[PDB]
């Protein structure tokens, strides 16, 4: 019915008017490319050949467009159509008369997409503003869209079968809009959290931590090769840190050339000891933490997620705030290229040697588990004798579960800490966790020491059978193993019952993901619909479409969210 | 023992039988995170291999068969009853867990191009097209014949030379996209000759005809099935996954000279990023690499049944130590480009990798001024129909946030469904307008002078007319 057509989603009101299928759009799998800049995207030649951008013939560009017309659709840098002044369209594929090929001012040649053509790149779902960013086009010879790895974080895209949509603006006016509002370098910093959206990620973060260690010393030829991939190099080789006995540069000395201009920033490495700041060696840091950059030169410190990641006050954030968006684009790209070419010399890996720990550490983990099981048994025996006293506001069952969970969690955390002590400097799990590239201390603990307690719906594994979790356990068993504690690590391998309980926990995780996607989508749509028309007027008042004053100044101070920074008042706290 | 239960009434035959068919192919499942086993169960259904031994006789749409399937070097005991050895889906591949050039980052994979040249992960894609010569129409007969442009008033300019006399292309003839596989003609009633009814190849199929069959179907009409074969060499978009839930595309392909090499001369067939392992905690992948190295050297297929207690990482490591390698499986690698030893020692070992059905060639689409829909006069939908990608409501909200009003306008009006209507000034209702006659008149006012041209999306015109048919008057007044 008419109401049925209009009312539903995919109806005329929403499915055909608010959004609609569009021309000049392309879609294919995305794959990585460290060599492309932040703003560049790699487009396949077939996609580039089908999509055409109409160019008006001017006296300046009549020769170039004439050559494109002569090439035709077959040769790649060709023109598919000619649009005359009258509006007549001469498709060049079917034979055009040699008279028709002649061009005069006012004709519009529809050239194939060429390198340097601004496009809009999208990945569904488009949760935030950074999910549609304008990219320059670079044509490369395979059939996947290729984007730089740093740009993956705004799009929330990884290269495991993901796909992205390419929209080509078709007018000079809309092309200028994208170029000056939506390009990738212009949206490095989000107004949402006044932090940079994009940060160094994956191999480059892990390798920048290793590059910036005090240990790293580079010989002359390696310095040559690293400086070759630095786009902003002045051409002057820095004087080596160690002139004699053999000239040897340092990793920080080369990274100082990457840092843009003169940027001053102080950050702390992830492994910074808390006592160091108070005690001596505060400035001569013993562990080479406390990153300090003065005059755009890395005086000291080991770079990590905190210094080069998506957080406020990061080196990339200070670069955008101080140097500008263009120099910051070059900063991202140079970090990636130079560090990724050093990683060819150094290399990274993950193996079983990393999961395995010392025999003493394994014995310590086992002893912690033994005494934890004994403690749970004592709690159970107290409960059976009714000696346990209920916690205020909780039933005896609830307080028993609280105490048992506390014992098991303390044992779990202690085993995890023992495992983390066992890790050597060379351990690669630790390299990735310390750099912040991937993983967490929890993952190391589960790999090496103890998987931990499996909880479903916020409780230990429930009694699915009559008064027992699995048929193998005895009725009314509240002990650690019965209710789901996985004593073995992933490396050690889970026993069968632990395998089933771990599967139950993982299923809860999967269900939560699937539910959260739908519910969050509905919330986001409703918020946008409620606030879509609110905008800052030229009075600088924030008004809706009805012109009702929502706010007299935006944010009550009339400032935009991206420019602002975290600062301390310093008059508030001190005593009189 | 220390008394737990003295009244056992039954015993499990083997605990590994709790897993199903797809989870039984996972080696060392107990050493993986649970969500990763769940993901492998889904990926293993999409892997490529010989699906059935009678695949030559069968004419199925969308059949993929790998050139050189191999059975796992590290296999579960329950795989024997699944017949996975008889019909394997995947190839054991020397895999290095290393960061080489940055093209294996995220979940992508660097593959050896020389290995790909030697047969590695090569597959065939068969697509079958069916057509039926239907005489059921009263005066319509869908005869199989080769359409002729002069004889048939309805025709198309795609290539018709391939068709033989019967209207069916012979086996062994290459077919590129937009070629006529089957030529069919419907005789046209002469109300007062021929509307073309041939079937055309899916764009970019680029295959060679394998089998052409002519039979009579259940209805007794002549039935023709044509199978087109396309070889599929792995590319830098294709998706490859292991048995431990690690999926990723091919980031780049380096030749054997460029790949890193061990001292023996072994270069990895696949390089996967070290960053995939830790967060996902798929330790079974690492244990399978170690057991695969041991198996390949020893000559015996390794045992990876879930719950064994006789196979430990330490035992596998000692076994590997006997065969002259580092006990944890690490190996000293040399950089292919410069020849210098990589300072870190890379973890190299054989691991069963699968090839998933998702390939870039099937998933690449581009649209520019294509056909439009009848109802909405908007671009079609789908790769087969050359449809444009949808600019959804969330996309328009992002563009509103950007402040790019004119890109939003182009994308939502000019690129999709531009249109013009004539609207009376006195009454907002649209007015009849004869451009060729140059006379523009509005019914209901008897007014010709006051009419204005309005540019609106065709979908908006349809919405306003659907409101009018409900007796709502959307009077759009320019004033």
């Amino acid at each position: 019915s008419l109401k049925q057509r209009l009312k539903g989603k995919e109806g005329r009101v929403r499915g055909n008017l608010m959004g609609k299928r569009v021309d000049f759009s392309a879609r294919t799998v995305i794959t990585p490319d460290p060599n492309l800049s932040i703003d560049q995207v790699g487009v396949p030649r077939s996609i580039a050949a089908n999509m055409t951008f109409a160019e008006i013939v001017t006296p300046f560009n009549i020769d170039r467009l004439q050559e494109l017309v002569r090439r035709g659709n077959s040769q790649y840098p060709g023109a598919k159509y000619i649009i005359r002044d009258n509006g007549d369209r001469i498709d060049l594929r079917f034979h055009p008369k040699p008279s028709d090929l002649h061009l005069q001012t006012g004709y519009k040649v529809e050239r194939h997409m060429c390198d340097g053509d601004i496009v809009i790149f999208n990945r569904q779902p488009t949760l935030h503003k950074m999910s549609m960013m304008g990219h320059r086009v670079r044509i490369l010879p395979w059939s996947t869209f290729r984007l730089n790895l740093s740009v993956t974080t705004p799009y929330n895209a990884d290269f495991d079968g993901d796909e992205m949509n390419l929209h080509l603006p078709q007018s000079l006016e809309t092309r200028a809009e994208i170029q000056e509002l939506a390009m990738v370098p212009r949206m490095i910093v989000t107004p949402q959290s006044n932090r940079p959206v994009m940060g160094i990620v994956q191999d480059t973060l892990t390798a920048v931590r290793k590059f910036t260690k005090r240990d790293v010393f580079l010989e002359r030829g390696e310095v040559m090769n690293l400086l070759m991939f630095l786009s902003t190099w002045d051409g002057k080789v820095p004087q080596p840190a160690i002139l004699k006995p053999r000239p040897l540069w340092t990793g920080k000395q080369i990274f100082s050339l990457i840092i843009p201009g003169h940027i001053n920033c102080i950050r702390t490495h992830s492994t910074h000891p808390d006592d160091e700041d108070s005690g001596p060696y505060k400035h001569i840091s013993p562990g080479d933490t406390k990153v300090v950059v003065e005059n755009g030169e890395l005086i000291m410190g080991i770079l990590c997620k905190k210094s080069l990641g998506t957080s406020a006050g990061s080196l990339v954030h200070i670069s955008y705030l101080e140097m500008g968006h263009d120099i910051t684009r070059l900063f991202y790209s140079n970090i990636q290229t130079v560090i990724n070419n050093w990683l060819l010399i150094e290399g990274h890996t993950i193996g079983i040697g990393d999961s395995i720990a010392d025999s003493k550490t394994y014995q310590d983990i086992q002893n912690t588990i033994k005494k934890a099981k004994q403690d749970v048994i004592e709690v159970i025996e107290k409960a059976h004798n009714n000696e346990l006293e209920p916690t205020p506001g909780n039933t005896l069952r609830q307080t028993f579960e609280n105490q048992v969970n506390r014992i098991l969690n303390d044992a779990r955390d202690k085993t995890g800490s023992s495992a983390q002590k066992s890790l050597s400097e060379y351990n690669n799990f630790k390299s990735m966790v310390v750099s912040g590239a991937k993983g967490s201390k929890i993952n190391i603990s589960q790999v090496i020491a103890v998987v931990g307690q499996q909880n479903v719906e916020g409780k230990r594994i429930p009694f699915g059978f009559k008064h027992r979790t699995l048929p193998h356990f005895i009725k009314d068993d509240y002990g650690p193993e019965s209710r789901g504690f996985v004593e073995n690590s992933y490396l050690a391998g889970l026993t069968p019952t632990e395998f089933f309980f771990h599967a139950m926990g993982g299923r809860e995780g999967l269900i939560d993901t699937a539910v959260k996607t739908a519910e969050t989508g509905y919330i986001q749509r409703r918020l946008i619909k409620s606030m879509e028309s609110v905008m800052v007027k030229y009075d600088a008042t924030v008004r809706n479409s009805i012109n009702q004053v929502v706010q007299l100044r935006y944010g009550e101070d009339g400032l935009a969210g991206e420019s602002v920074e975290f600062q301390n008042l310093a008059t508030l706290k001190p005593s009189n | 023992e220390v008394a737990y239960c003295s009244t056992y009434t039954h015993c499990e035959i083997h605990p590994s039988m709790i897993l199903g068919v797809c989870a039984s192919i996972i080696p060392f499942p107990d050493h993986n995170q649970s969500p990763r086993n769940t993901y492998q169960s889904a990926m293993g259904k999409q892997a490529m291999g010989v699906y059935i031994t009678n695949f030559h006789v069968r004419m199925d749409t969308l059949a993929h068969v790998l050139y050189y399937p191999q059975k796992p070097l590290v296999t579960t005991r329950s795989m024997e009853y699944l017949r996975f050895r008889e019909l394997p889906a995947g190839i054991n591949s020397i895999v290095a867990i290393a960061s080489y050039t940055g093209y294996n980052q995220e979940d992508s994979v660097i593959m050896n191009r020389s290995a790909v040249d030697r047969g590695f992960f090569r597959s065939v894609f068969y697509r079958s097209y069916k057509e039926q010569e239907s005489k059921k129409g009263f005066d319509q007969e869908e005869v199989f014949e080769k359409p002729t442009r002069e004889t048939c008033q309805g025709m198309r300019h795609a290539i018709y030379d391939k068709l033989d006399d019967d209207g069916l292309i012979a086996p062994g003839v290459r077919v590129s996209g937009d070629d006529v596989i089957i030529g069919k003609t419907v005789t046209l009633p002469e109300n007062e000759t021929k509307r073309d009814c041939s079937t055309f190849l899916r764009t970019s199929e680029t295959g060679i005809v394998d089998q052409v069959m002519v039979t009579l179907n259940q209805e007794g009409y002549k039935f023709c099935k044509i199978r087109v074969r396309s070889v599929r060499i792995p590319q830098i978009g294709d998706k490859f996954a292991s048995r431990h839930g690690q999926k990723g595309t091919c980031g780049i392909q380096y030749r054997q000279e460029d790949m890193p090499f061990t001292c023996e001369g072994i270069t990895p067939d696949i390089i996967i990023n070290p960053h995939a392992i830790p967060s996902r905690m798929t330790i079974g992948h690492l244990i399978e690499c170690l057991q695969g190295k041991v198996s390949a050297n020893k000559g015996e297929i390794g045992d990876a049944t879930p719950f064994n207690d006789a196979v430990n990482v330490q035992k596998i490591s000692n076994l590997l130590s006997d065969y002259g390698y580092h006990l944890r499986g690490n190996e000293v690698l040399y950089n292919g480009f410069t020849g210098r030893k990589i300072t870190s020692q890379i973890f190299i070992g054989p691991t069963y990798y699968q090839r998933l059905k998702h390939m870039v060639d099937d998933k690449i689409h581009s649209r520019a001024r294509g056909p439009i829909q009848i109802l909405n006069r908007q671009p079609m939908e789908g790769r087969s129909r050359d449809g444009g990608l949808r600019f959804g409501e969330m996309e328009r909200d992002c563009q509103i946030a950007h402040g790019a009003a004119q890109f939003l306008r182009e994308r939502l009006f000019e690129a999709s469904d531009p249109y013009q209507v004539h609207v009376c000034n006195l009454c907002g209702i649209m007015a009849i307008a004869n451009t060729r006659t140059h006379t523009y008149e509005c019914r209901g006012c008897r007014n010709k002078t006051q009419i204005s041209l309005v540019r609106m999306p065709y979908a908006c015109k349809l919405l306003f007319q659907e409101l009018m048919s409900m007796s709502i008057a959307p009077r759009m007044m320019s004033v």
Binding site: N405, R412, G452, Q454, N455, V456, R460, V486, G509 | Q33
Partner: peptide
């Protein structure tokens, strides 16, 4: 899969 306070 860790604990009651962590993740499943």
């Amino acid at each position: 899969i860790w604990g009651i306070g962590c993740n499943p």
